[PDB]
Amino acid sequence: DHIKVIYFNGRGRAESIRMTLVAAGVNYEDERISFQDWPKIKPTIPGGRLPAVKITDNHGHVKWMLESLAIARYMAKKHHMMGETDEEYYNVEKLIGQVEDLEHEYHKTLMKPEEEKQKITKEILNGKVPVLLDIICESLKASTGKLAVGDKVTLADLVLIAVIDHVTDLDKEFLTGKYPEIHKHRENLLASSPRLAKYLSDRA
Amino acid sequence: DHIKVIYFNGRGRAESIRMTLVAAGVNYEDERISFQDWPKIKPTIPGGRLPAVKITDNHGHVKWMLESLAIARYMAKKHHMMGETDEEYYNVEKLIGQVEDLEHEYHKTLMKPEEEKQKITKEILNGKVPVLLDIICESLKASTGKLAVGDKVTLADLVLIAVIDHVTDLDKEFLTGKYPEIHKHRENLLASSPRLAKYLSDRA
């Protein structure tokens, strides 16, 4: 099969797809759609929304996958990254839901004028961002291993890395000297996944 | 009149429009179009390309302006930022054309996958970027004043600031310890235009 990740934002909703495929050792192809190319490409994408995954098999047959986080869930489930037990599966979804709430606050500042972006960034950083970070910090403490859920890589580990990079995009010093469990999670995940470390370092 | 700057990129071709209006003391309104809103907004924009300037007068009448650099030229010409003499007008366009060539190389890395962006960035930084910077550096030396052309602010001063920020976007250390005339131009322009300094500092 040939997996093509059709996206637009360099670090948007498609990062959970790539990080899941990178950690699973599955190859893929990046196809970034430009702002000027989107009007003519959108009718070709089922649903008309990005990101989307296009899978082509050895015979040229095409099947389309939508809803970035649903794609990452399916790829992580097939490669044992959604919890081995039902209780671990809940803990994976518990941190994912908390990360989604933090991604929801970060999304409020995207694609706004410079004056409006700084205002909304100023509100969430003094509002729900530190509150949600404490909830995420408590979920990491309740884990049975060095990672978010258990001791091996799950989807909750990868969506957490993406949302923390989004938080640092709003303020590079928001986590400096704070949230030690979040900093130790990145160190433990980077050591537990050498392929994830190479992707993150080469992306920088 | 009410000037609306319809754009998409936070720091793209619309920066020359804003910096020209800021230095001239003319108020404007930012209207950023999102990637998801572009398919339905494009038929409303004459020409179907961004950025574009929408001017509404006291009676609601609308006149449209296209081609970002042509808009900046008209606004700079009306506020005496295109040279007082014909020979100064040539020197303004001389550095603008050299900046456009450097913007042309920077545009090759935009909206590409992470692997492809790093490759093209690696080629221009070892190619035309240092060559064009030397040509821009020599044009600054031949000036009759502390700025790019003469002693007062012109459009060549502002497009140079925008292209240098684009170069630092590719590599923050490309100008460290190199090109002293380029660093002194930003210092002289910031002192010659307090409104430009506030815009640049508030934008950061």
Swiss-Prot record, chains A, B:
GO terms for biological process: glutathione metabolic process. Its EC number is 2.5.1.18. Residues 85-204 form the GST C-terminal domain. GO terms for molecular function: glutathione transferase activity. Glutathione binds at Y7, R13, W38, K42, L50, E67, S68, D101. Gene3D superfamilies: 1.20.1050.10, Glutaredoxin. Keywords: Transferase. Residues 1-83 form the GST N-terminal domain. It comes from the Eukaryota. It catalyses: RX + glutathione = an S-substituted glutathione + a halide anion + H(+). Belongs to the GST superfamily. Mu family. Homodimer. Conjugation of reduced glutathione to a wide number of exogenous and endogenous hydrophobic electrophiles. This is Glutathione S-transferase class-mu 28 kDa isozyme. It comes from Schistosoma bovis (Blood fluke).
